[PDB]
Amino acid sequence: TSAVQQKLAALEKSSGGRLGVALIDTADNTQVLYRGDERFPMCGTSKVMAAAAVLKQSETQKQLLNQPVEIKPADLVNYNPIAEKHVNGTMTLAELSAAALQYSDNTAMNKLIAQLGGPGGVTAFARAIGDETFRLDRTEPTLNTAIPGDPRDTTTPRAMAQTLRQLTLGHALGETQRAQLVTWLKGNTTGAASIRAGLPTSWTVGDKTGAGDYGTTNDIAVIWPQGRAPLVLVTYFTQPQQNAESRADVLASAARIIAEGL
């Protein structure tokens, strides 16, 4: 183990939970992993895969993002900050993607999942871009149950870091679609206390958070440091008590550790 991994282990010990980290440094294509091949509940970080899958569809259906989708009262779930403003109205697939990614709207995520034919359609897209680990099994809100040991709606930090790299810096998506995803991630509103809080303020960051039961608190980010090659960082955290409070500070701390030297 390296000093980085040792610091992450110490953070984990003090936190009382289980911490998973994967950093990809595109400068030399190296990876730093902590519990990198253990499965963790994704919660809302899975919204990146769903939005990306719809972007992929739009590469051959060029008007798809503009397609209005009906929002019915019965569609609302447990957290619908944007969709609730469109009950008995519509949101386009672009608007649903922005809401799911930038506000972590759960109704918006369910519409993306439906557009893909269900959770299996999101998983199928993951497989198509070379992610053999990701699995989406449920819709919102049950995909965030985060039960210890439950393989449903999980991935590993290594796999999610590799996929996030391919989606944003690589070419799993077409050029316009890649840029659109990056724009959405950069404009996220929910990440100020997570990875962003542990990085220098001059660094540009795009991220997607997630949260669930068992105090599950997650963040995945693409990072552009000042005058250096970009990084991808996944920080997953989950706890023993079903009713544990969120711990965004732990993600900020992991980011602070990872940033040393970069």
The site for ligand CE3 (CB under 6 A) is made up of: 43-44, 78-79, 104, 106, 141, 144, 190, 209-213, 246
Cα 184 to its chain centre, rounded Å, is 12
- Who's near 254: CB < 8 A, 6+ residues apart? 8, 11, 19, 21, 195, 198, 235, 237
State in angstroms the smallest separation of the CB of 149 from ligand CE3: 18
Residue number, nearest CB to ligand CE3: 44
Q: Tokens 């965030």 map to which residue?
A: 144
**Closest CB to ligand CE3 among 41 and 121?**
41
**Closest CB to ligand CE3 among 23 and 99?**
99
CA separation, residue 95 to residues 99, 166, 174, 253 (Å): 6, 23, 19, 33
**Closest CB to ligand CE3 among 32 and 167?**
167
What's the rounded Cα separation, in Å, for the pair 84 and 207?
Answer: 24
State in angstroms the smallest separation of the CB of 111 from ligand CE3: 15
What's the rounded Cα separation, in Å, for the pair 259 and 262?
Answer: 5
State in angstroms the smallest separation of the CB of 214 from ligand CE3: 9
State in angstroms the smallest separation of the CB of 36 from ligand CE3: 21
**Closest CB to ligand CE3 among 95 and 213?**
213
Is-contact 185 176, C-beta < 8 A? no
State in angstroms the smallest separation of the CB of 236 from ligand CE3: 12
**Closest CB to ligand CE3 among 34 and 214?**
214
